[PDB]
Structure 1
Amino acid sequence: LIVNVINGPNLGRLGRGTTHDELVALIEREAAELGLKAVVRQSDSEAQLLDWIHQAADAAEPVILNAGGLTHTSVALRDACAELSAPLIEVHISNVHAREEFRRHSYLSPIATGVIVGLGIQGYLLALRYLAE
């Protein structure tokens, strides 16, 4: 049973400790243990992100999404996620409520199933464990 993990702009740069390739490996391993398949994806392109969301909508597949900056700015992304019928878990590696004020609003949260912030890369793994149950 399949889960999509979609990362947005600047998440390629993870480890400006952990690199993005490692994150894929961690997630892929954790997903194996839980009896899931993780499809992990990254793009700085909104249009590319939207296409992945569209497909997940069509497939009725759940999504773990970390949209980077677009979280606070993209109504379009929000609208594609609003179409998903399966669960959507919004994920942030950092605690967004501990930095600038503008980071404390999210267009995705209201239409998300739930949200995890500030638990680093393990937020992704916790999100997997939710969708497993």
Structure 2
Amino acid sequence: LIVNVINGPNLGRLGGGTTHDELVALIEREAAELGLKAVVRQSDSEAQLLDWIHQAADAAEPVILNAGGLTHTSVALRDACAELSAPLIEVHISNVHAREEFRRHSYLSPIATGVIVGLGIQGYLLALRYLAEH
């Protein structure tokens, strides 16, 4: 089945050392090393993430979500994310607890299945093979 990998603001600026296009490629290759198909999408717009997230709620598909800094400010994002009936994994490339004190709070974490933080790009792959239990 399908896994939605949604990246938030500033994530298209990637390049860790890997770029975003390279990240789409490693996520997909792996997904396929499992019975999984991955759809990686990226936008700097709250309304666009909102859209993708609704689309995943109607589909009832897992979502992986690294929301950038909206992790820390968006409730809109949280509320439309609660409805998700499949797992939600929150991913942060860098360790947000080792930075400014405001990064140590997330409107998403409470409603996520789980959260992976600070393990780099591999945060994405790790999450995929949590999901591969359905």
Q: Common fold, TM-score beyond 0.5?
A: yes
SS at match of 1:40: strand
Structure 2 gaps of 5+ residues are none
Deviation at 1:16, TM superposition (A): 8.6
Deviation at 1:122, TM superposition (A): 0.2
Deviation at 1:35, TM superposition (A): 1.4
Change beyond 3 A, Cα 1:16–1:123: closer
Deviation at 1:17, TM superposition (A): 1.1
For residues 34-63 of structure 1, what are the alpha-carbon distances to aligned partners after superposition, in whole Å with 9 as ceiling and x for unaligned?
111000000001000000000000000010
Partner of 2:108: 108
For residues 78-102 of structure 1, what are the alpha-carbon distances to aligned partners after superposition, in whole Å with 9 as ceiling and x for unaligned?
0011010000000000000000000
Change beyond 3 A, Cα 1:16–1:45: farther
Change beyond 3 A, Cα 1:95–1:16: closer
Structure 1 gaps of 5+ residues are none
TM-score, length of structure 2 as denominator length:
0.98
> What is the CA–CA distance in structure 2 between the aligned matches of 1:49 and 1:89, rounded to whole Å?
15
CA RMSD of aligned residues (A): 0.8
For residues 57-82 of structure 1, what are the alpha-carbon distances to aligned partners after superposition, in whole Å with 9 as ceiling and x for unaligned?
00000100000000000000000110
Asked if the contact 2:16/2:120 (under 8 Å) is kept, the reply is: no
Deviation at 1:26, TM superposition (A): 0.2
TM-score, length of structure 1 as denominator length:
0.99
Deviation at 1:25, TM superposition (A): 0.2
